Structure 1
Amino acid sequence: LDPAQWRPNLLTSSSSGTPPPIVYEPYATAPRLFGRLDYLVDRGVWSTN
């Protein structure tokens, strides 16, 4: 059982609500909009979770 593959990945948290989350993203490239999926290298093997 891989501990990394079964863990809730924190994206954000709201300590607020006034003001609401205002995300100005002027560099709206796909990695900067939808997020990145980075990988770990294990002996030349690409892995992700």
Structure 2
Amino acid sequence: ALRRLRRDWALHYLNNRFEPLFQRFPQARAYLEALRARLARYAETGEPLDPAQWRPNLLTSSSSGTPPPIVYEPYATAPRLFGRLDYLVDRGVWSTN
């Protein structure tokens, strides 16, 4: 019950912080809702949030379209074409974010 109280108090507080962000980024509604749920989960459970696991990866740089994004890849391999999913090793175990 105290975990429930922590979670719902956190949700009530974060509503005021996410509503302006909801208006600012309506397209990011799903991501913002998931992040708010994760923050509530951290508030109740106490599990330390990983910033590297909840930081949106900005693959693209905002281009004006003039000139449009032009990429030349003479050495066109699968990691260099589709992008490679990097991994980190902890205790000899593969992991990624």
Q: Please classify the TM superposition score into its range, dividing by the shorter chain length.
A: 0.7 to 0.9
Q: In angstroms, what is the RMSD of aligned CA positions? A: 1.3
More helix by share: 2
Gap runs ≥5 in structure 2: 1-48
More strand by share: 1
Gap runs ≥5 in structure 1: none
- Paired with 2:63 and 2:71, the residues of 1 have a C-alpha distance of 15
Identical aligned residues as a percent: 100
- Paired with 2:61 and 2:87, the residues of 1 have a C-alpha distance of 24
- Paired with 1:48 and 1:17, the residues of 2 have a C-alpha distance of 33
Cα offset for 1:40?
A: 0.8
8 Å Cα contact 2:87/2:94 also seen in 1: yes
Higher relative contact order (CA 8 A, sep 6+): 1
Higher CA-based Rg:
2
- Scaled by the length of structure 2, the TM-score of the pair is 0.45
Give structure 1 regions of 4+ aligned residues with deviation exceeding 6 angstroms: none
- Paired with 1:15 and 1:33, the residues of 2 have a C-alpha distance of 20
- Paired with 1:15 and 1:42, the residues of 2 have a C-alpha distance of 37
Instruction: Choose 27-36 or 3-12, whichever is displaced more.
Output: 3-12
- Scaled by the length of structure 1, the TM-score of the pair is 0.80
Cα offset for 1:19?
A: 0.4
- Paired with 1:15 and 1:23, the residues of 2 have a C-alpha distance of 12
8 Å Cα contact 2:63/2:69 also seen in 1: no
